[PDB]
Symmetry: D2
Subunit: 296 residues, 4 copies
């Protein structure tokens, strides 16, 4: 019943001259380790999994795996895809190269049925013997992993242990944990980190933690120790940055914040992702000032 | 800032031969008082505020005040309307007839602007000197009281002390209490009662409490005493009843349950409200059996 | 099946000193008569049906019926309400006082089921012997009259002859007219007047016609005579005014336009409706200069 | 000024046999469309399961499409979309170099970029090739919407962007588009509302129903383009029930089921996460089909 919980980070993927900055990628992973982060998620939605080639996707799981060798920090590698043969491929690469588990996003664009989602995830789970965390973000995929399908996959496949929820649907998180209380519900939405943890959630996969890993790690651990008045206190402080980090489509605002804080050298994206508007740029710079950003 | 918080019930309005049954109305109020309920909300959305004549709206506030005289139970009278001159009339009647405060639903159908909503509520509050609780349910009104508008009304009109949220948006309730922590956030959605209380909410205006007032009252008091593990446990047990009470439009499922429990004489509505479907009738009867329904 | 179709206007209700300007009302309906309008709709959503008293609602049907006598222009009186006893009351007043038919909006706020909508409209239909036109606006009522419910009411009720659609759902209007081609589909959305008429719709109940009755009247008859390129050309010229007349909630922009054109003396609303933002005021005045506004 | 590909078009299904592309049924399904009045074929779209095909299989079905439409008036508007711009430019350049008459490019999915990103995304695609490029907006599946302003700006700034295949169920947006930019080719991507889009100035459809009933879809489009809206609307009303039942589940699950039930494909095979429909929906597809007479090969 292997799980990966606690404070986790959906790592941004820095670019340098149109190639992956492998130097800076490892240097951002050591900033997360030294600020209380329990696990890192390479190549998620925040890692621009869509514009990376299969070798770049694979190269940044390997960099993640060795950058956390000799630490407690686990690697929950992003291995999702809208094609099952593609998702199994990323899952098999992650196991054979030392990953502690995989995050697998619901298939996007092709909108599979609930029966399709079941067989999609069942094929991935049986491909490996490492933990598998589901990932539901219907605003991005066009499809919903129903509560019944999540619970069925948790009960029918032995390495499927929970779901990364990014739904803004607190009703579904009461639904999930009331009918299946043994599952690990992970928040994928920074604004509601504390409410999800306060209802029995056991971790977060955060975007803000790229910028403020100490604050996000403190929030999760306070909540897991049932210290809910301090957990809510950090969640209230983080609301302004949590919402302005979505003024444009993630990960455009967070990479802007990392550039403004000097944590990445160049504000580079891969198309169709671009730098934000000049107005929103000013709004990112203004919200950052109310927080104390840790350096290297 | 005079407040009305705690476990509250949006009481159903029983009909007999298409006229308001005034004697069963009072007998449901000693069932609520006698099971730990802290306040009652006469003629809300659950009370069919839209289908009562102006005298029946007023007569059911009078019964609530009279039946709660000599007790600790307050009366937060429903006084909302989509016409401001109509809302001021009900608000001043509520004070002049002994109500401790008023609930005021956002104007429906006429979809006012944020400036209109500000002036709408600014006009009501200035009519009375008793607490005024806002009520935001955009799924039924077609308009939403913005987070800024709620906070502005809370800060500018002294008797306006909080809001009954039934938006199903936990992000908005972090938004409200992180920027204005002195406001009384009231849950208007039974399925997510505990998460709203766990984030600093100070009460509920419940539909489920019509049938199980002791459980809903226990949930709120557990949470207000910061016993979040027992509050969540009741919230998880109540999920099935909380959602099956909305398989059809409120208050059709709850009135069906009250009739099945022998607490009201007739499964009677006034059009356009009708008895539920044949199928949903069976679903209410089936979910009720897993709960212990307290009598008179 | 007696019908009321063609180019129709949802009349604005002018106020002076917080009262209904009854003589500016009659002179505004006669501006509509002399510009090709086939029927007038007193006290619709554009007429602020929500803030008028029940006697003021009745007074503006009387003015509408009286002004149209001796004309070929029909009066489709607004008689909808979220309470069936209120809608039947208005329906019987319209028949007994000379209206040619009634418009009845879907019940708002209390969200009846499809079974409730059937009994609601059937009770209204058996109330009178004049044509009854349904009115579907889900953005404001929170409920929708399904295609199946509309078709049943058309087939089961003699005087029920069609539906005013304001959903922005051209799929539903293909659904309606492909399965029941004998019904009169009326456009309730000015921007898509021509597409709805081009698919077999037989009229519009317009907001823009308050300001530009000649263009809406020309558009409808061009389309009804199957002159689709001239109907489409007028619909294309009117797009800019059709959409900016909803930059704020109707009838706030249209009353602003009527005031700017000197067709009403005071830009007065009844709360919670208010005058528009100062920006939208400037942008309405800006779009208006591209059209030739007919006087009295 | 602009080169376009309009008329009655078909979003081709991709038949599978034992987990690979049945290349001989693919060519025989495009050869069924040609003789039934279809003006162009769209290989490997959303209906073609572009997401589960390898890049080498995606390219193989553009090649089959180009060869099968040689000697005929039937054009190839090849599916070349991707959520990665370098991937979309790759598919765009392959299509030109291999004989396609144009490319369809879906709005980037999942990464949901901003309007500025969509502009630069499509400008890179348009400048990679010199053949027409048709935009494709389906927000229900991609999570993003190409605003009216971005479509119009892309139409005016780049030669080969000549229109958009709309699948939004938003007739307001199609009045917005053609009232402010009437020189663009608006293509319906939603079979139920083919006629309303054509009646407002649309100049073609990229159809799913045409996979099963190409003659009816072809007659509908040409009736509408000849401004005979009473026969065009009559066919659109006749086609509504099948137009709706082909989406009881997510496309292309119902359409491939219908093709299998009609004996036009041999195996009801998908690539995961796409699967066979429920037995319940299976029965509802079978029953709506009988009220129509399906042409064979
Ligand atoms: N077009 C694929 C490429 C994924 C490659 C691995 N990250 C997608 O965006 O899903
Ligand atoms: N149908 C009326 C009822 C008013 C009288 C009691 N609230 C309304 O919704 O405003
Ligand atoms: N506020 C009431 C007024 C109804 C009187 C008739 N216009 C309602 O909208 O239901
Ligand atoms: N799964 C990939 C497939 C790309 C190859 C064909 N488009 C995607 O959706 O982008």
């Amino acid at each position: 019943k292997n799980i990966i919980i606690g404070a986790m980070t959906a790592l941004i993927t820095p670019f340098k001259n149109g190639k992956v900055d492998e130097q800076s990628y490892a240097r951002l992973i050591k900033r997360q380790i030294e600020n209380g982060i329990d696990a890192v998620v390479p190549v998620g939605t925040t890692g621009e999994s869509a514009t990376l080639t299969h070798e770049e996707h694979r190269t940044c799981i390997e960099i993640a795996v060795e950058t956390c060798k000799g630490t407690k920090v686990k690697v929950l590698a992003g291995a999702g895809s809208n094609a099952t043969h593609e998702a199994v491929g990323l899952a098999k690469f992650a196991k054979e190269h030392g990953a502690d588990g995989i995050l697998s996003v619901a298939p996007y664009y092709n909108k599979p049925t609930q029966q399709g989602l079941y067989e999609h995830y069942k094929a991935i789970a049986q491909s490996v013997d490492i933990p598998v965390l589901l990932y539901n973000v219907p605003g991005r995929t066009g499809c919903e992993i129903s509560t019944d399908t999540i619970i069925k996959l948790f009960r029918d496949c032995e390495n499927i242990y929970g779901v990364k929820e990014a739904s803004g649907n607190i009703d579904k998180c009461v639904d999930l944990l009331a009918h299946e209380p043994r599952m690990m519900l992970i928040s994928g939405e920074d604004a509601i980190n504390y409410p999800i943890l306060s209802n029995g959630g056991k971790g977060v996969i955060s975007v803000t933690s790229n910028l403020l890993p100490d604050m996000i790690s403190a929030l999760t651990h306070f909540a897991l120790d049932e210290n809910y008045k301090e957990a809510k206190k950090i969640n209230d402080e983080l609301y302004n940055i949590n919402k302005i980090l979505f003024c444009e489509s993630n990960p455009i605002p967070i990479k802007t914040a990392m550039y403004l804080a000097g944590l990445i050298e160049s504000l580079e994206f891969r198309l169709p992702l671009c730098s934000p508007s000049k107005e929103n740029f000013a709004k990112i710079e203004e919200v950052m000032k109310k927080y104390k950003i840790k350096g290297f």
